[PDB]
Design a protein around this ligand. Structure first.
Ligand code: ADP
Ligand code: MG
Lengths: 370, 241, 241
């Protein structure tokens, strides 16, 4: 009766029932493996740790996210993550529960085909549907007209919509996300002597990212200020009681989104691709799109993004032209909340892909009806 | 029969420990995550879902300080092997550590599947075959209540009559004689406490006859389909034919 | 009964909301285009023009913020489907958007046809058959007023006697006894306010007996054929035979 729903981001994995407001299952998309020789008897006998357990035992492990840039690459590890989600976390069977899924736009068709195969064959799910992560943000916002700028773990796509109809020729997809920022921060910290190279240490770098970094409203004034003073510096304690001191790196890193040439990546940047995705759209529509820009995803949670974007795109756009931004606290969940709204509605009793239909056509359904 | 909330527990936890305590378990469980570490209880459970146990391999209770954890881990590892291989459970990220260490998640991750398997073995046992469903059971319960002339029919497992549990007691009296006191049969059962009185009463007495009820009064007074169906199912249970 | 012009409304708007409020509607309409967005009122209206409603499909009032608009649109879409298919309305350029968005045109575009259908169902109900017309009704009203010896005949629905509404009150007293105060029966009813007094009075009391009058004093004090005919029609209404 009640459907399940999970976004399956390339970083975090989020799940829960239909109709709820917030999830009860948050673990990262991890599969860990040991990399040492075991000596004690009884211990061992666990080829794989998954999720938060693997994160806690990361000291002895190699941790591998199977997903990269919204694409699945390692299907066995992925299968195990699915099992963990359904059984160990959600405490429920698949066979008598319809399920919903999402993915970034402009993914390979094979990914959808594999997900359908896995469900209907392995898990024997009664019914299924796939969605676009951007669209659900609008349902969560209770709107129709706006641009959804999802900037997640491994991908950053941009979708304009007007009155329930999408303009697919204007879609844009980037490869920047919080992951490249993690690596870039790690690369900087060399400059102050701190050297973090391993996987678990990368998780520490992520913990620094989501606690100390912010956005500069003006990058150069901020930089010259940091150079002339230590008032901007902050310290952070590592797990071993060590202390790391950080200065300009707090804002030097997320500026990468607005100057990707730091990482040797020729591209437009966020402030520019948002504009270009509107210039493709028809002229009469551009207004409500400027005035209903929406954000989503966890990398949108730095302090100072929204103010910066308004200090940005405004300069690119005409005068006498309202730039509005929408960036609520419920980000990192608007996708999933939209999914929960979706599965509760009545209409979808048609929309679901069903088992008998897959038994007839095969995986091509998801591209037939989608 | 000391029902009551423990020192920061959850509504599912009490259901699972009541499942266990109602199921004839030899050491009284105060609370799960400290009593299941030796796993002996789960070894008692496998047999009840018709899954053999090699008691020779099962270490007896760890009495030595020195042996201690290692014996417990041998037990827990073999328990997880029983889960995965023979009885066909999904325990992808689980091993003996998580049981002995009292991980709050994965313990339950085994337990709810065990519970489902016992329920399913039952559901096979009622109707000779594979499964049953609300059709046959609602048919036969309404036939039974029709015979005793006592009270009204089950039109669904969402019927608010079960909020009082009076259909349940009408039924317990329908299958077997008046081995039961009716002064608690009190209409206008509107006080929550009174619905709970009749409900504790019904559960206790279904267990008295031998019907293998594990329910809570909070699960009848509030109508809950899977759970209430299970109550009636295990009343199909001990005596049909 | 707070009659009065709203914050920039139109003469038709007040007629339609008074149609609604006089028709026993559960939430008091302050004004149309903000209260009809959930469409529940129109679902109440279909039944009154003898058009079924599948209340299972009808979403209950949108309490969640998150559901919100989507539930309203499901409701509005089903309402428009009822309009087009079963009840045979013309809604060529209409969908759920226009109802939920409060488009000032198309809302009314549904409403006036609903109003006409209710009126027509009535017109069938008076004379067993298909329709009626001014012939039969003017015949019978003049017969009735002849019986009570009170006052003059209706020669047309343009008769200036109705500017005072005294034929209407003579009539309300003709069908049923003197359950009504005559000190307001005041000839030389030349002040517009006094015609309005007698008119508010007549409307209120036709509703008191049960005659399903939706009119305005401004529609009797100023004679208006379709509308005044409707007043007399719904007085045929509750008790003829
Ligand atoms: N306070 C914060 N500031 C900046 N970044 C954050 C913060 N909290 C989480 N993040 C980042 O946001 C990402 C989570 O975004 P999310 O929408 O869950 O990705 P996905 O859509 O792929 O699940 C994480 O990868 C993390 O690095
Ligand atoms: Mg994402």
């Amino acid at each position: 009766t009640t459907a399940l729903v999970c976004d399956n981001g390339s970083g975090l994995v989020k799940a829960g029932f239909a109709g709820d407001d917030a999830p009860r299952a948050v673990f990262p998309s991890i599969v860990g493996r040991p990399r040492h020789q075991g000596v004690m008897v009884g211990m061992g006998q666990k080829d794989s740790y998954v999720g938060d357990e693997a994160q806690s035992k990361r000291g002895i492990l190699t941790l591998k996210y199977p997903i990269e840039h919204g694409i699945i690459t390692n299907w066995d590890d992925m299968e195990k993550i699915w099992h963990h989600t359904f059984y160990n976390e959600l405490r429920v069977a698949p066979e008598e529960h319809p399920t919903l899924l999402t993915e970034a736009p402009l993914n390979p068709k094979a990914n959808r085909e594999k997900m359908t195969q896995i469900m209907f064959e392995t898990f024997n799910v009664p019914a299924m549907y796939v969605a676009i992560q951007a669209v659900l943000s609008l349902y969560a916002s209770g709107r129709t007209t706006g641009i959804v700028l999802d900037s997640g773990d491994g991908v950053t796509h941009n979708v304009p919509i007007y009155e329930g109809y999408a303009l697919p020729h204007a879609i844009m997809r980037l490869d920047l996300a919080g992951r490249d920022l993690t690596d870039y921060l790690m690369k900087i910290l060399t400059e102050r002597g701190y050297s973090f190279v391993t996987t678990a240490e990368r998780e520490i770098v992520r913990d620094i990212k989501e606690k100390l970094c912010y956005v500069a409203l003006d990058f150069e004034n901020e930089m010259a200020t940091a150079a002339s003073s230590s008032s901007l510096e902050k310290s952070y304690e590592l797990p071993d009681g060590q202390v790391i001191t950080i200065g300009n790196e707090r804002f030097r890193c997320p500026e990468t989104l607005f100057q990707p040439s730091f990482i040797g990546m020729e591209s437009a940047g966020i402030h520019e691709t948002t504009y270009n995705s509107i210039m493709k759209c028809d002229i009469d529509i551009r207004k409500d799109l400027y005035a209903n820009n929406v954000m989503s995803g966890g990398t949108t949670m730095y302090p100072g993004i929204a103010d910066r974007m308004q200090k940005e795109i405004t300069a690119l756009a005409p005068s006498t032209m309202k730039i509005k931004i929408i960036a609520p606290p419920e980000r990192k969940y608007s996708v999933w909340i939209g999914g929960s709204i979706l599965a509760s509605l009545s209409t979808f009793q048609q929309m679901w892909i069903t088992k008998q239909e897959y038994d007839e056509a095969g995986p091509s359904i998801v591209h037939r009806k989608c | 029969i000391d029902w009551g909330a423990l020192e920061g527990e959850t509504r599912e936890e009490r259901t699972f420990r009541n499942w266990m305590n109602s199921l004839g378990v030899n050491p009284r469980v105060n609370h799960l995550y400290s009593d299941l570490s030796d796993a002996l209880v789960i070894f008692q459970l496998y047999e009840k879902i018709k899954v053999p146990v090699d008691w020779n391999r099962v270490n007896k209770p760890p009495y030595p300080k020195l042996g201690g954890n290692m014996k417990k881990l041998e037990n827990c590892n073999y328990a997880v092997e029983l889960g995965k291989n023979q009885a066909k459970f999904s325990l992808v990220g689980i091993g003996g550590q998580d049981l002995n260490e009292g991980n709050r998640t994965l313990t339950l991750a085994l337990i709810w599947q065990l519970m489902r398997r016992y329920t399913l073995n039952i559901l096979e046992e009622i109707g000779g075959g594979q499964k049953v469903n609300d059709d046959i059971i609602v048919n036969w319960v309404n036939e039974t209540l029709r015979e005793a002339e006592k009270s009204s029919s089950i039109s669904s497992f969402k019927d608010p009559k079960i909020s009082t549990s009076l259909p349940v007691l009408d039924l317990i009296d329908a299958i077997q004689p008046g081995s039961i006191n009716y002064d608690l049969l009190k209409t206008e059962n509107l006080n929550d406490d009174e619905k709970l009185n009749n409900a504790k009463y019904a559960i206790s007495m279904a267990r008295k006859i031998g019907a293998r009820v594990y329910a809570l009064p909070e699960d009848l007074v509030e109508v809950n389909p899977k759970m209430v169906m299970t109550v009636f199912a295990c009343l199909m249970g001990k005596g049909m034919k």
